[PDB]
Design a protein around this ligand. Structure first.
Ligand code: MG
Lengths: 467, 413
DNA sequence: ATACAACCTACTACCTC
RNA sequence: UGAGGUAGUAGGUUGUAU
């Protein structure tokens, strides 16, 4: 018989200084933080893809309703939410002929097919960036289904250096040109016209059309320079960092690459949220621990970035990771850390099998419920029933994060509150919240793109080039 | 008289006034504002006076630091007070406190006796208060679905939890009893000490040379006849309470290694007991699961919970998985699975179709069904009224009731 | 290379939002 | 890859003794 504490829901800062808990309920009521004048959209693909994208873009401008608006707030139209124009009259179209699509798509090797076809899609974007006088905010790459299906590492044809994945390769080959692009699937925008067996859609978007419009609009607004929202209760000079280890695969020897994300608040009360890139490499197979030199370089770069943005050194530095730091790592970290800076290394995992079932209800346990095992270990339910939207973030019984303060000493309640607050900064989607801290998720997103290529030297820090 | 009049400092309160006016128009209220409805090339003061006198039913005042002592705002307030006196309506003028820098003691004499609506903390809460007051006062409004959606969105934006006691059922089975001592049997050769160390009738393991057992040496006489002639020493004999409390030490064996060996022994005993119970076994990538057959229950309705069923033409069965652990306290984590068999005693070779069937079946179960099935399976596994035992003569006791959790917050469906 | 526990990642296939 | 979640399937590392 043990007691669960409850952590109050964090709030995000929308326009007019107003606060809210749901991004959809704050954007529809108050608006985005900063305003831009419009989105000049570039499109690449076949004329059918351009037609589909134009149809969706004209469809977005009107309000779209869901089956139940309480769980799914309606989309009031792009202009009525983001106060900027995203029309089909600003589209700059580039044609990829279906003849040239089928010239590379039927190569026997997946690697060569994906490389050639990514290059075909990429050259036009680069040429229109350098050799054309238009100004394009976001490049919307509409990708058919045949390309998408046969552009995976394990994909095979139906009996007649870089990664084999189309998306990661595509995003990695633009990193030296800093072009924010959004990859779309024709089924995403034209789900009604795509059927499999009996005239029914493969993807049933009928009940969730408003949510799809919300997610697409938020992603496009963020990619074009917008600031849809920001955290309100972010603390003082304490800065958060998040590390993720990835397998570089058969690029150059079995290697592991560590990529980071960083988050804090500047003197202007805004939110700084970027990545630490140039992945730090451990050559030992199966070893997800950074060597002392690599860890020293990583912490030095993070502290230098913080001091350049702020003007002094952070009071406290939190380091989220999915692994456990050994003592050599922390010795290397402390040899760079100044005296006034206090380091906490927190490990977040989602593999401990603890499910809490409500005794009588048909719904699941509340989100934000925490079970402090002890002063250095706790369980947090970042996925659970939300009274506001009256539906849990997961259909089944949710699994909680096991948050353990691996290194250093700090208040576990403050760690839990900071993690729950960090779960609200997912600019890649328009949701209430997600079950993972956004630092680790965005570090994973950065790493999956960085490890897809070998020619990257100085990757950009902004997330719109990766997400 | 349907108009709603909003007074403000014209170039300083533009943002809030426009926001509030557009919102109020959104829910079907007719609003008159000088920044949206005042015509060009018109006598604006006469028009404002005529609107206040003959058109407005409510008078909302944007009370801020700029509009506190603005002459036009004061003239509008005076005319509104005269109209309110004529109308015999006490709630005609409704100030809206939107500025924090304006103290509640520095307000002007015109609204010093009226209670404002707090917009400083939250604009949406202030709008909720305005809408509640309007509904109470029955302000005229002509609406259809969009207005209701916006009204519900404004009213439901502040929904939160209530202070209610809640009880949750977990999947952790707490271990109640432990063997008195941990026995290290120096068996020496003992005919390779039964090098299989996995087909023995009791859980056994070799740390350096001593078999780690909670039982006696003569309990292994059948599998190891040499242990019949082995001198009964079984030295060290660490008491379980001391080792489990992190007190045992010294270079013979580390504390963490001792705990890991205890966990291994518990897992081996759990597997042996489960195989003793005659339960069907399923091999997985990271663990093993146990599921009953169709004829194990009559008729698969233990405590009216059901453990076997038909999806379309295949027979789904609930399956259990156990994992003994010591952190934070000695417990057994229990995991749930669903396994599909085409016939009475068979299995489906393709793991892909098995996974697809499991995902299709688990989409319509919910926490109540999951918990009831888990509790029924555990209670079936229980050999007694309130506990079941794992055989180490020595034995350990684990309760059949999963440990509860308590919370001070909940919701109201 | 064998046995275990205690951690780690890459890869699909469904489900709903 | 519009986005989250839940599962399953493979592989590996450290430690403890042969
Ligand atoms: Mg995205």
């Amino acid at each position: 018989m043990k007691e669960l504490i409850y952590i109050e829901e964090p709030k995000i800062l929308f326009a007019h200084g107003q606060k809210c808990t749901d991004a959809r309920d704050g954007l529809a009521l108050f608006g985005p933080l900063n305003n831009l004048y419009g989105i000049k959209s570039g499109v690449i693909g076949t004329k059918q893809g351009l037609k589909i994208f134009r149809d969706y873009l004209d469809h977005i401008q009107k309000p779209i309703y869901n089956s139940n608006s309480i769980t799914r707030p309606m989309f009031p139209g792009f202009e009525a939410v983001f106060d900027c124009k995203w029309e089909s009259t600003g589209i700059t179209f580039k044609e990829v002929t279906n003849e040239d699509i089928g010239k590379f798509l039927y190569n026997s090797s997946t690697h060569k097919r994906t490389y050639d076809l990514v290059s075909l899609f990429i050259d036009k974007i680069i040429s229109a960036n350098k050799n054309e006088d238009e100004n394009v905010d976001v490049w919307f790459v509409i990708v058919p289904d045949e390309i998408y299906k046969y552009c995976r590492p394990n994909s095979v044809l139906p009996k007649e250096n870089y990664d084999a994945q189309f998306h990661d390769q595509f995003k990695a080959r633009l990193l030296k040109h800093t072009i924010p692009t959004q990859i779309f699937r024709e089924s995403t925008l034209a789900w009604r016209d795509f059927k499999n067996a009996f005239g029914l859609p493969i993807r049933d978007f009928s009940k969730i059309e408003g949510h799809l419009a919300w997610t697409i609009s938020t992603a496009a607004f963020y990619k074009a320079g917008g600031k849809p929202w920001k955290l309100s209760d972010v603390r003082n000079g304490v800065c958060y960092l998040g590390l993720v280890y990835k397998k570089v695969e058969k690029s150059k020897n079995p290697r592991n690459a560590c990529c980071a994300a960083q988050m804090f608040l500047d003197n202007g009360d805004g939110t700084v949220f970027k990545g630490e890139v140039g992945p730090w490499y451990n050559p030992k197979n199966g070893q997800y621990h950074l060597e002392p030199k690599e860890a020293k370089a990583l912490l030095s770069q993070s502290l230098q970035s913080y001091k350049e943005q702020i003007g002094e050194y952070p009071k406290e530095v939190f380091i989220h990771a999915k692994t456990r730091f050994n003592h050599q790592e922390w010795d290397a970290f402390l040899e760079v850390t100044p005296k006034e800076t206090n380091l906490v290394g927190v490990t977040i995992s989602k593999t401990k099998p603890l499910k809490l079932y409500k005794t009588e209800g048909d719904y699941t346990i509340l989100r934000g419920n925490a079970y402090v095992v002890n002063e250095r270990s706790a369980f947090l339910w970042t996925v659970g029933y939300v009274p506001k939207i009256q539906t849990a973030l997961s259909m089944e019984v949710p699994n909680p994060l096991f948050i353990e303060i691996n290194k250093g000493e700090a208040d576990i309640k403050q760690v839990l509150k900071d993690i729950l607050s960090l779960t609200k900064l997912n600019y890649n989607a328009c949701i209430f919240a997600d079950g993972e801290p956004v630092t680790l998720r965005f570090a994973d997103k950065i790493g999956e793109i960085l490890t897809a290529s070998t020619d990257i030297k100085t990757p950009p820090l902004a997330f719109k080039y990766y997400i | 008289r349907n108009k709603i009049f909003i007074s403000h400092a014209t170039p300083d309160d533009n943002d809030f006034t426009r926001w509030l006016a557009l919102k109020l128009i959104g829910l079907g209220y007719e609003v008159w504002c000088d920044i949206l409805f005042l015509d060009k090339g018109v006598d604006f003061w006469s028009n404002i006076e005529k609107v206040i006198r003959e058109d407005t039913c409510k008078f909302l005042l944007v009370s801020s630091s700029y509009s506190n002592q603005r002459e036009g705002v004061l003239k509008e307030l005076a005319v509104a007070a005269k109209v309110k006196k004529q109308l015999k309506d006490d709630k005609f003028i409704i100030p809206l406190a939107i500025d924090e820098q304006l103290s509640y003691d520095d307000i002007n004499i015109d609204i010093v006796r009226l209670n404002a609506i707090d917009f400083k903390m939250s604009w949406a809460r202030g709008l909720k208060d305005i809408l509640e007051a309007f509904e109470k006062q029955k302000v005229p409004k002509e609406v259809a679905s969009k207005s209701n959606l916006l009204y519900q969105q404004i009213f439901l934006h502040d929904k939160s939890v209530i202070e209610k006691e809640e009880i949750y059922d977990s999947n952790w089975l707490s271990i109640l009893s432990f063997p008195e001592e941990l026995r290290f049997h120096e068996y020496n050769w003992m005919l390779p000490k039964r090098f299989d160390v996995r087909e023995l009738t009791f859980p056994a393991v070799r740390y350096k040379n001593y078999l780690c057992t909670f039982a006696w040496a003569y309990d292994f006489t059948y599998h190891l006849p040499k242990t019949e002639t082995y001198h009964k020493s079984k030295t060290i004999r660490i008491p379980t309470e001391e080792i489990l409390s992190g007190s045992y030490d010294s270079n013979f064996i580390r504390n963490a290694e001792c705990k890991r060996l205890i966990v291994q022994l518990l897992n081996k005993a759990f597997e042996l007991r489960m195989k003793d119970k005659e339960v069907q076994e399923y091999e997985m990538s990271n663990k093993t699961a146990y599921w009953l057959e169709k004829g194990k229950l009559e008729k698969d309705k233990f405590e009216k919970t059901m453990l076997v069923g038909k999806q379309k033409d295949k027979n789904w069965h609930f399956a259990i998985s156990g994992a003994s652990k010591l952190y934070p306290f000695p417990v057994l984590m229990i995991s749930s699975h669903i396994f599909f068999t085409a016939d009475g005693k068979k299995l489906i070779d393709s793991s892909s179709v098995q996974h697809s069937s499991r995902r299709r079946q688990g989409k319509n179960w919910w926490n109540n069904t999951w918990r009831t099935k888990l509790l029924a399976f555990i209670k079936y596994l229980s050999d007694d009224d309130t506990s079941f035992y794992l055989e180490m003569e020595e034995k350990v006791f684990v309760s059949n009731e999963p440990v509860k959790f308590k919370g001070n917050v909940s919701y109201n469906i």
